[PDB]
PDB file of C-alpha atoms in Angstrom:
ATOM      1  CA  UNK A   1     -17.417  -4.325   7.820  1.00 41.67           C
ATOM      2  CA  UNK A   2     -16.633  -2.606   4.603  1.00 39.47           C
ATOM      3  CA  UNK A   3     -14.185  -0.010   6.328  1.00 38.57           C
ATOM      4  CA  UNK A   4     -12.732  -2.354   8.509  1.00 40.04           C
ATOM      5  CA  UNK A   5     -12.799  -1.895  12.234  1.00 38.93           C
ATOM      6  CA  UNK A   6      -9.243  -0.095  12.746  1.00 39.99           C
ATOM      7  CA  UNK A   7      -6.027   0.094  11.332  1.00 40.47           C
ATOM      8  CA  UNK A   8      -4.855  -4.079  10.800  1.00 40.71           C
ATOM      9  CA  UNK A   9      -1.103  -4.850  10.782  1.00 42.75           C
ATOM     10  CA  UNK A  10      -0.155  -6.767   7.177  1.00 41.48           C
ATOM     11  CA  UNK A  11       3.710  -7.493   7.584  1.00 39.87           C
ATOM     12  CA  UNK A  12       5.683  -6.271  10.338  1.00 40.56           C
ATOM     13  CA  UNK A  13       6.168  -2.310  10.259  1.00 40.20           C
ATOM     14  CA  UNK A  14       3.040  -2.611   7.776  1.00 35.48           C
ATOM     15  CA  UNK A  15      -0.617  -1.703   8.554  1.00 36.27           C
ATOM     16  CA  UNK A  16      -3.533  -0.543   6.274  1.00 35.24           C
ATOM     17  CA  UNK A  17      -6.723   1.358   7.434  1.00 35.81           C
ATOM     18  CA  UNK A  18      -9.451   3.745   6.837  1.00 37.52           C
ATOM     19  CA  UNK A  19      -9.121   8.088   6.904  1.00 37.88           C
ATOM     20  CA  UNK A  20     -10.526   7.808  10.557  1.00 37.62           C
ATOM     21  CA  UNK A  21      -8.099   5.405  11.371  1.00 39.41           C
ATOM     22  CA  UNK A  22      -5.103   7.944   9.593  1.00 38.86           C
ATOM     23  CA  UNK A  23      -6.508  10.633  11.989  1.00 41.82           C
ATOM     24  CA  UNK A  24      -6.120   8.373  14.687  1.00 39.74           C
ATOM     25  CA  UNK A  25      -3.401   9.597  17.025  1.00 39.74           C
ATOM     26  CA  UNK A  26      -3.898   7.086  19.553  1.00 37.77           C
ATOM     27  CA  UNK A  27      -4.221   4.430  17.091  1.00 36.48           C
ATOM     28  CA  UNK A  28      -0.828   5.614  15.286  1.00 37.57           C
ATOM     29  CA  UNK A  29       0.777   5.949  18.867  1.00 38.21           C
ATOM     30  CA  UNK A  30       0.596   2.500  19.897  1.00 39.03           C
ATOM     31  CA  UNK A  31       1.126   1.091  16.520  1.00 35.88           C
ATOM     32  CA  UNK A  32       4.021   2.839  16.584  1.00 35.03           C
ATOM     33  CA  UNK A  33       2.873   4.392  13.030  1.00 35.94           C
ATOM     34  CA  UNK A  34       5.701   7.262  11.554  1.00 38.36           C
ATOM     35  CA  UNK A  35       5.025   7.236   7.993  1.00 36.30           C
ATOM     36  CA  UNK A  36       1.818   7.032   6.463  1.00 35.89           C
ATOM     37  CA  UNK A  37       1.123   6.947   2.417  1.00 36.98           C
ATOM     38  CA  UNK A  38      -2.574   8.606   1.751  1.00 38.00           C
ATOM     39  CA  UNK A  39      -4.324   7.281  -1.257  1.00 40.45           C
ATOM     40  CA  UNK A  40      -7.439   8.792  -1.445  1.00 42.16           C
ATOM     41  CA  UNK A  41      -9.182  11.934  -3.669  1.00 42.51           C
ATOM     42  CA  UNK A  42      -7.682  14.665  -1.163  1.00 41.96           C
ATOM     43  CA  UNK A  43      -4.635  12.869   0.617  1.00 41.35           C
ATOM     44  CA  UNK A  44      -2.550  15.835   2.186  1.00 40.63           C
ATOM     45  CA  UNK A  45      -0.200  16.260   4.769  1.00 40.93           C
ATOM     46  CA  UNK A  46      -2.126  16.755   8.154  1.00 43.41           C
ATOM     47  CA  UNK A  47      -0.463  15.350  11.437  1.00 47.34           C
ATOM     48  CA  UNK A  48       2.516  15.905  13.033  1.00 45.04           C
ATOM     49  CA  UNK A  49       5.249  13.174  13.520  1.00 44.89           C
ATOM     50  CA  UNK A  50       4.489  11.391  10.623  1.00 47.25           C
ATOM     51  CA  UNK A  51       6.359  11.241   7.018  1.00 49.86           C
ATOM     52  CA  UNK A  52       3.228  11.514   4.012  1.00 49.34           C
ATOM     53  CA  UNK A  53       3.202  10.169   0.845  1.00 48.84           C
ATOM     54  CA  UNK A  54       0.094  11.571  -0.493  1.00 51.37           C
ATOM     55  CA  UNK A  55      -1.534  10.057  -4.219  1.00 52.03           C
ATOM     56  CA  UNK A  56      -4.348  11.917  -4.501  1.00 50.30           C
ATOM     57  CA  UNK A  57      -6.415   8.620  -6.948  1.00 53.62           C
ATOM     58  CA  UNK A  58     -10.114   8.522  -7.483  1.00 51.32           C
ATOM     59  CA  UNK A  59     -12.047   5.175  -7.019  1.00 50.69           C
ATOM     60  CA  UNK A  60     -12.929   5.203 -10.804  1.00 50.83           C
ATOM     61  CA  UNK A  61     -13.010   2.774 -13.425  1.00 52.40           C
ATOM     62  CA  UNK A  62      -9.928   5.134 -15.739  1.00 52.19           C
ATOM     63  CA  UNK A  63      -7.549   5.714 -12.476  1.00 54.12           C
ATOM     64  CA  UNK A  64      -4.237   4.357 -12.814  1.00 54.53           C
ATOM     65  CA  UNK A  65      -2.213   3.021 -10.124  1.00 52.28           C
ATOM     66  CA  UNK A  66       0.581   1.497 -11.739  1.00 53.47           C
ATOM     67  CA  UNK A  67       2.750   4.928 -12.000  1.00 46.66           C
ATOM     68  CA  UNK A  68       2.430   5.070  -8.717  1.00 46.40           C
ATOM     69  CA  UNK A  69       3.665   1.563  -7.626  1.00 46.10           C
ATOM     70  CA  UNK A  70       7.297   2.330  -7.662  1.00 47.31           C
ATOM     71  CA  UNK A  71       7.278   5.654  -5.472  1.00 46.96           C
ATOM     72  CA  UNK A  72       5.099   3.866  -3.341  1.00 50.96           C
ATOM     73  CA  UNK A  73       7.455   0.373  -2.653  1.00 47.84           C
ATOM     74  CA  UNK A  74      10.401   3.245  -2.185  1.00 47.13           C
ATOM     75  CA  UNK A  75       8.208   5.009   0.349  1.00 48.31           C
ATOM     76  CA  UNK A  76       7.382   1.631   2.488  1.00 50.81           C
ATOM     77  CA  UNK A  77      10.298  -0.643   2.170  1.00 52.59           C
ATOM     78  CA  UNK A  78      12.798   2.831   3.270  1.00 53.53           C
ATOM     79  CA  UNK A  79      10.363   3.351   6.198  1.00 51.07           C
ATOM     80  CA  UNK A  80      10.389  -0.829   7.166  1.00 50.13           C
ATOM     81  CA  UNK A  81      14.126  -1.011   6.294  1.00 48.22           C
ATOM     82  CA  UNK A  82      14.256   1.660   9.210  1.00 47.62           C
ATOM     83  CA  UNK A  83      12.522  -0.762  11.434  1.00 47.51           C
ATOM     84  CA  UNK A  84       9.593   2.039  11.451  1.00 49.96           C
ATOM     85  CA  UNK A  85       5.937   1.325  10.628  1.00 47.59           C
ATOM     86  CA  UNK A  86       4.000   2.814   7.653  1.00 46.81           C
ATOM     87  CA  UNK A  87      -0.053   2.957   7.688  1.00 50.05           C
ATOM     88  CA  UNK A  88      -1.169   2.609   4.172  1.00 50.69           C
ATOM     89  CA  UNK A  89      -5.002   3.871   4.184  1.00 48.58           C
ATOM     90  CA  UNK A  90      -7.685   5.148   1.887  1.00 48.03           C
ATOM     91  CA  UNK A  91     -11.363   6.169   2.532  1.00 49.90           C
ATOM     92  CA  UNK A  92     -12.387   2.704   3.225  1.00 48.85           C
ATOM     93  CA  UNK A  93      -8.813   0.704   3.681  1.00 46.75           C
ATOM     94  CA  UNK A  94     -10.433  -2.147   0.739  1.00 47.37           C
ATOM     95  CA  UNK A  95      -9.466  -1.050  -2.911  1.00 44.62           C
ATOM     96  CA  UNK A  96      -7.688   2.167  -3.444  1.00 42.73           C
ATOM     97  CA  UNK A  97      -4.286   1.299  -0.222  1.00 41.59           C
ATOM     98  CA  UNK A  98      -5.051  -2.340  -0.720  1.00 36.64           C
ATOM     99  CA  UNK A  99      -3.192  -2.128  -4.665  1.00 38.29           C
ATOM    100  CA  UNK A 100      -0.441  -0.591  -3.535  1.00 38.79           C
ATOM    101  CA  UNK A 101       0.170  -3.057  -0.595  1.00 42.67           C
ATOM    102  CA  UNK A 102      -0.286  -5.563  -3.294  1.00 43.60           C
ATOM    103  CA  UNK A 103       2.735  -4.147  -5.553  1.00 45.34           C
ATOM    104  CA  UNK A 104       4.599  -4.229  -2.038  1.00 43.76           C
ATOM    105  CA  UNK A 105       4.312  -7.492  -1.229  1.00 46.00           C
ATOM    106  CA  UNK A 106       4.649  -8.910  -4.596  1.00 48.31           C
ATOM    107  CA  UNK A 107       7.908  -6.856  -4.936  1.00 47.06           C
ATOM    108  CA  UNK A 108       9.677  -8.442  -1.444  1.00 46.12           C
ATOM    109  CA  UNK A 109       8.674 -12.037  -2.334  1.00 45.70           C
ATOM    110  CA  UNK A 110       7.897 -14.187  -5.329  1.00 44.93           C
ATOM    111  CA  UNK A 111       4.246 -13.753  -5.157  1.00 44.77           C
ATOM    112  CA  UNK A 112       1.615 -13.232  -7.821  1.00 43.13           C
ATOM    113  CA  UNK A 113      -0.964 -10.486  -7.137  1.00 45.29           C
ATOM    114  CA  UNK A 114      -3.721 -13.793  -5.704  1.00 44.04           C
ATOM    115  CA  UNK A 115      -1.277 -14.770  -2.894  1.00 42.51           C
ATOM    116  CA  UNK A 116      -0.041 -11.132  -2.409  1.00 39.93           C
ATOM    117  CA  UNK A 117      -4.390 -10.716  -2.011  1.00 41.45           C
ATOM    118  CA  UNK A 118      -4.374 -13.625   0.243  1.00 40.93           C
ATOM    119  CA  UNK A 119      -1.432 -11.965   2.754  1.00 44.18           C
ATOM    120  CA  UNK A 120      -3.308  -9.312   2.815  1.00 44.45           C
ATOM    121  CA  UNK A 121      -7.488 -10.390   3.426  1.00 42.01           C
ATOM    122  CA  UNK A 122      -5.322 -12.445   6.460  1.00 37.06           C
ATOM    123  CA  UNK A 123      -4.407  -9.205   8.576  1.00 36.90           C
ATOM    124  CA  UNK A 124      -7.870  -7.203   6.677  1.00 39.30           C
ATOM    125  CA  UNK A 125     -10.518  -9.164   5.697  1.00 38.49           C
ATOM    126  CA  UNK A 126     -12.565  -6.386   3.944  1.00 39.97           C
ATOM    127  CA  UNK A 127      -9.267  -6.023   1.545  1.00 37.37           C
ATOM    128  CA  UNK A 128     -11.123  -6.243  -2.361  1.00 37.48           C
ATOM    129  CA  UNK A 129      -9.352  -4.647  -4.524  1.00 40.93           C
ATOM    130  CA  UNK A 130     -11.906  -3.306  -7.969  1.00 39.06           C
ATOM    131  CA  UNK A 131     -11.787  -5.097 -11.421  1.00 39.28           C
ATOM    132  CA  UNK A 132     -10.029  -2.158 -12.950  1.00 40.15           C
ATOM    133  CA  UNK A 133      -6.854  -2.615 -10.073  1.00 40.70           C
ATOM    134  CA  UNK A 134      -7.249  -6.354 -10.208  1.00 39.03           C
ATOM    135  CA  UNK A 135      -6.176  -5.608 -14.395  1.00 37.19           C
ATOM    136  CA  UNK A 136      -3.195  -3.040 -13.342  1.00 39.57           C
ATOM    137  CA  UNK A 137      -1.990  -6.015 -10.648  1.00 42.02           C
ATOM    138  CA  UNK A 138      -2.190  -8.628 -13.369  1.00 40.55           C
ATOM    139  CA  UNK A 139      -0.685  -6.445 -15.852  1.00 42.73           C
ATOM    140  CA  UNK A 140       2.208  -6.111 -13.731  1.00 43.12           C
ATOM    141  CA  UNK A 141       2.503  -9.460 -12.820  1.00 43.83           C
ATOM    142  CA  UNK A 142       2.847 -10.583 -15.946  1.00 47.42           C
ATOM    143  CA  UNK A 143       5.638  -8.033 -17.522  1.00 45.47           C
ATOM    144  CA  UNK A 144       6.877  -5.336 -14.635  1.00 48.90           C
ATOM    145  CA  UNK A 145       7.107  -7.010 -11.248  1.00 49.28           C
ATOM    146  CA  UNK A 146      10.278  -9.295 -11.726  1.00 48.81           C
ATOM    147  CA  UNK A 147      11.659  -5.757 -12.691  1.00 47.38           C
ATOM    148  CA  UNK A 148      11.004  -4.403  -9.534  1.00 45.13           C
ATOM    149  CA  UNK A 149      12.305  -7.277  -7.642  1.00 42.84           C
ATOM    150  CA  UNK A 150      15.912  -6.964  -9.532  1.00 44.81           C
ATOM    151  CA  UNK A 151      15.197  -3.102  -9.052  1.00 42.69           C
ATOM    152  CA  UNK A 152      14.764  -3.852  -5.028  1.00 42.83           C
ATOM    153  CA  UNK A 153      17.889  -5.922  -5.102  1.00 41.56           C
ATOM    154  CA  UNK A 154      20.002  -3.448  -6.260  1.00 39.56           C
ATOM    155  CA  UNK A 155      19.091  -0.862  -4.587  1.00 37.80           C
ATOM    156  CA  UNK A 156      18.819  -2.291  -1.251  1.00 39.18           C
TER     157      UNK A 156
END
């Protein structure tokens, strides 16, 4: 359905989901969930146990993403690097959490922003990111994300 149907695991240590699903406890409990990044219009801190990232972004054609991608890899690949699990949700879990999963994966392997798309619709079928994040991804495809990798390398 076009929330999904609970929080889907992505990558090891890497799930994305809806705000019910972020609310969760049980849910986060035996997904073993201690860091979650909130990407919606009023992501806040709200549970306890759980490390936030919070990037309070609209679903609007002018919101950029892109500034965000870098905090956002540091806040995951830390958390996975820890052998913890991060839930990366919006309002829906399609569009807004499914970008910055994107960035992720194409930042630990060689992938374009397609095949990062394709990891992703396999663990989350409803994952469909807009046109205006589709341009950010391509954007950095083309002239930021073999930056990032090198970045990654060095610093881990």
């Amino acid at each position: 359905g076009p929330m999904g149907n609970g929080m889907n695991k992505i990558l090891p240590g890497l799930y994305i989901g809806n705000f019910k699903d972020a609310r969760d406890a049980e849910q986060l409990s035996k997904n073993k969930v201690t860091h979650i990044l909130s990407v919606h219009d009023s992501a806040r801190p709200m549970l306890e146990g759980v490390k936030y990232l919070c990037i309070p972004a609209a679903d609007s054609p002018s919101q950029n993403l892109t500034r965000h991608f870098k905090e956002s890899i540091k806040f995951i690949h830390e958390c996975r690097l820890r052998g913890e699990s991060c839930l990366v949700h919006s309002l829906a879990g399609v569009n807004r959490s499914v970008t910055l999963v994107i960035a992720y994966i194409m930042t630990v392997t060689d992938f374009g922003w397609e095949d990062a798309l394709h990891t992703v619709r396999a663990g989350r079928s409803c994952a469909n990111p807009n046109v205006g994040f589709q341009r950010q991804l391509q954007e950095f495809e083309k002239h930021e994300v073999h930056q990032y990798r090198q970045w990654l390398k060095e610093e881990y």
